[PDB]
UniProtKB/Swiss-Prot annotation:
Cofactor: Zn(2+)
Post-translational modification: Proteolytic cleavage of the N-terminus removes the signal-anchor and produces a soluble form of the protein.
Organism (species): Homo sapiens
Keyword Calcium among UniProt keywords: yes
Protein name (record): Neutral ceramidase
Effect of residue 441 to A: Loss of ceramide hydrolase activity
Disulphide bonds in the chain: 263-277, 270-285, 349-399
Outcome of mutating residue 275 to A: Decreased ceramide hydrolase activity
Tissue specificity: Primarily expressed in intestine. Ubiquitously expressed with higher levels in kidney, skeletal muscle and heart. The ubiquitous expression observed for ASAH2 might be an experimental artifact due to the paralog ASAH2B.
Cellular component aspect of the GO annotation: caveola; extracellular exosome; extracellular region; Golgi apparatus; Golgi membrane; mitochondrion; plasma membrane
Outcome, altering residue 297 to A: No effect on ceramide hydrolase activity
Sequence segments annotated as region (Required for correct folding and localization): 660-670
UniProt-listed Enzyme Commission number(s): 3.5.1.-, 3.5.1.23
Length: 670
């Protein structure tokens, strides 16, 4: 009668040192430690008999790459055969901008990441696989419920004037320029106890800005963190049976920095078409979060989403029932004929980035003085583009108009193709719920159009009252998708619409077709599409301890006494964190002494948002590992200690484990 449901969560955190953070594309934003862990969260549904399985995976990562998906799918086949295929598995990225880079195959993202990290890549894959394996081996008879509600005051539109380019009658049908609606998917067993939840909600996880060097899952990660910690009472962060995943949506033009765009020098509003300031230009125009710092902003936004997610979960009553289905297709997005009429058609283009891509956003500005809204090129940069990369054909220029091409990645294939041509489109249906796997970042109106169009298709073919959600950053990254009208303004998202002005119209057409195949039960009649390619292709340092010391020894102990609210800091002689990159669940623990049992009990780990782990490189193999415990006001007085877990490299090449334990210290009542 009802579904078999499995859920799982697994650590998919790469290395937290000697690597850049992915998302902002900032030059010097390298990882120097960890604020919280990154998890892969998998949800597996099956028919009563165990047939027709579907897998949705929400991953604490900036983007899901083509290479990541292909690697994961191959290993899934090896272990599970025909159970989990390209069509019934969705891999979605939460879009955190504080995750380790270097997991792409296409040249553009390899340049941004400054290379490819096998270590980081493999642990991501095993992390994703582990989450799936847990869900697979822990399936139970149960039911699925769904609920909807608005989340207030956690978002603004970071390109509102481009939104206004959309037709009036269309804009008149909505109350806001952002999708305030959260959709919670509730999962329980037949005994009524909690299994897990999924929460779709449109927002950029960029509350931690590009000045940050600590690995974390940002606002949506913190929301997942609060949900899991509330349900899994008595469990440490990252542990506990209940699994709570926030899923990315149409977040393309949605910012969490609700104070809005202001000029750093004057404090004036720079909410204009160019996102620029009269004195200092675009680099002065920045949107800030609600908190005292980025940590506070992240938690304020994250808590609000958690609060609404908690309420909707509790009050969920509408049951989800019906058959499971899935449809997938590979599509050459460079050559899609899109119909604007019955009589009139146009075409998608070979991938290209516009001038305004280099301008960044109010959530993270570019360094090169580019401004958003550039509909014209200049002889200066056109020259540089021609001399270095090559001169764009007249076809690709005309196809992309009015976008002025900065990078014509579609015609740049050395050493490997810079941008993908083959893109995944897929829909997975759980009864009346349809999930569209979007290969990038849909803007607000883009997601609205595709949702309703796909819903309408289902309706036309007998599947009534379908709830359709946009699942962002799925399967392969193709940057942003704007509406035709938004594309004209050529702001950052529009300049990052790589297949041209008709990219959205193509997807709506493609996804409508997928929905039709599912409803008419003719998904087998869908053409496979062209298969995507699998491309094949820091000096080693021996860690050292100070003379007369060894790894894990305390160089700086904590204060003898602390009051709640303060920050306890302990410094150890350390080794490179990348040596620890698979039984290394944490770099640190905060432990409380219990006098009655005369024993130490772990209260925090490196996944706790209250703790921070910094790594600083020294001379000739020397290095420090700093653990900070930001003592919460709710923390109980007592005797505490901080421990450190790492790995050192000796040399043939051997990795050894070590531990450090700080002298006991105390939190006091005042
Ligand atoms: C990302 O968010 C952090 C907040 O967590 C921002 O840090 C802030 O940086 C600004 C400027 O760098 C600091 O403002 C002022 O800096 C002057 C330097 O002359 C200083 O003397 C003043 O005390 C004043 O505060 C601000 O203090 C600092 N805040 C914190 C908590 O460190 C950072 O600027 C943000 N980055 C981006 C790119 O938005
Ligand atoms: C590791 O920590 C120690 C102490 O916390 C740092 O030592 C300071 O080192 C500088 C020069 O390196 C000295 O001038 C200071 O007097 C030291 N302070 C103390 C309190 O001893 C050391 O520099 C750190 N090393 C790294 C690579 O971060
Ligand atoms: C990458 O790592 C995997 C497992 O960690 C290993 O099997 C593979 O050979 C590595 N590839 C390279 C090029 O080092
Ligand atoms: C088809 O598009 C053309 C181009 O603007 C337009 O002139 C024509 O009215 C459209 N057809 C219909 C039926 O609206
Ligand atoms: Ca932590
Ligand atoms: Zn984004």
């Amino acid at each position: 009668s009802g579904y078999h449901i499995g859920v799982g969560r697994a650590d998919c955190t790469g290395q937290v040192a000697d690597i850049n953070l992915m998302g902002y594309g900032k030059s010097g934003q390298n990882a120097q430690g960890i604020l919280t862990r990154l998890y892969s969260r998998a949800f597996i549904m099956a028919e009563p008999d165990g047939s027709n399985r579907t897998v949705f995976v929400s991953i604490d990562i900036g983007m899901v790459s083509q290479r990541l998906r292909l690697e994961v799918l191959n290993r899934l086949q090896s272990k599970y055969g025909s159970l989990y295929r390209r069509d019934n598995v969705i891999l979605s990225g939460t879009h955190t901008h504080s995750g380790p880079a270097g997991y792409f195959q296409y040249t553009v993202f390899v340049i941004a990441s400054e290379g490819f990290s096998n270590q980081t890549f493999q642990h991501m894959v095993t992390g994703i696989l582990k989450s799936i394996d847990i869900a697979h081996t822990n399936m139970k008879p149960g039911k699925i419920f769904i609920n909807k509600g608005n989340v207030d005051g956690v978002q603004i539109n970071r390109s509102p004037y481009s939104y206004l380019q959309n037709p009036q009658s269309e804009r008149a049908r909505y109350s806001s320029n952002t999708d305030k609606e959260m959709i919670v998917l509730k999962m329980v067993d037949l005994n009524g106890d909690d299994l897990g939840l999924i929460s779709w909600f449109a927002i950029h996880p960029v509350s931690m800005n590009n000045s940050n060097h600590l690995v974390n899952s940002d606002n949506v990660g913190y929301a997942s963190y609060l949900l899991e910690q509330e349900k899994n009472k008595g469990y440490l962060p990252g542990q506990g049976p209940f699994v709570a995943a926030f899923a990315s949506s149409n977040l393309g033009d949605v910012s969490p920095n609700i104070l809005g765009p202001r000029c750093i020098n004057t404090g004036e509003s720079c909410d204009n078409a160019n996102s620029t300031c009269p004195i200092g230009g675009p680099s002065m125009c920045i949107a800030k979060g609600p908190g005292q710092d980025m940590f506070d902003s992240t938690q304020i936004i994250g808590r609000a989403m958690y609060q609404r997610a908690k309420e909707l979960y509790a009050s969920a009553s509408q049951e989800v029932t019906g058959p499971l289905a899935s449809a997938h297709q590979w599509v050459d997005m460079t050559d899609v004929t899109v119909w604007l009429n019955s009589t009139h058609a146009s075409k998608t283009c070979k991938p290209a980035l516009g001038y305004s891509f280099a301008a960044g956003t109010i959530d993270g500005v570019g360094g090169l003085n580019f401004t958003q809204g550039k509909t014209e090129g200049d002889p200066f940069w056109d020259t540089i583009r021609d001399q270095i990369l090559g001169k764009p054909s007249e076809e690709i220029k005309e196809c992309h108009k009015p976008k002025p091409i900065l990078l014509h990645t579609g015609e740049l294939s050395k050493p490997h193709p810079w941008h993908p041509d083959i893109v995944d489109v897929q829909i997975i249906t759980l009864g009346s719920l349809a999930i569209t796997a979007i290969p990038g970042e849909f803007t607000t109106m883009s997601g609205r159009r595709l949702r309703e169009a796909v819903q309408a298709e289902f309706a036309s073919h007998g599947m009534q009252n379908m709830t359709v959600v946009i699942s962002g950053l799925c399967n392969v990254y193709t940057h942003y998708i704007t509406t035709y009208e938004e594309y004209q303004a050529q702001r950052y998202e529009a300049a990052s619409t790589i297949y041209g002005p008709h990219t959205l119209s193509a997807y709506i057409q493609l996804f409508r077709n997928l929905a039709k195949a599912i409803a008419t039960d003719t998904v087998a009649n869908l053409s496979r599409g062209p298969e995507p390619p699998f491309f094949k292709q820091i000096p080693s340092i021996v860690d050292r301890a100070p003379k007369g010391r060894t790894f894990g020894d305390v160089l700086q102990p904590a204060k003898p006494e602390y009051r709640v609210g303060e920050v306890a800091e302990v410094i150890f002689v350390g080794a490179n964190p990348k040596n620890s990159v698979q039984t290394h669940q944490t770099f640190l623990t905060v432990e409380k002494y219990e006098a009655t049992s005369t024993s130490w009990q772990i209260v925090c780990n490196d996944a706790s948002w209250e703790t921070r782990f910094y790594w600083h490189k020294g001379l000739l193999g020397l290095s420090n590992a700093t653990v900070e415990w930001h003592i919460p006001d709710t923390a109980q007085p007592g005797i505490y200690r901080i421990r450190y877990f790492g790995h050192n490299r000796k040399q043939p090449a051997v990795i050894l484990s070590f531990e450090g334990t700080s002298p006991a210290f105390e939190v006091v009542t005042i």
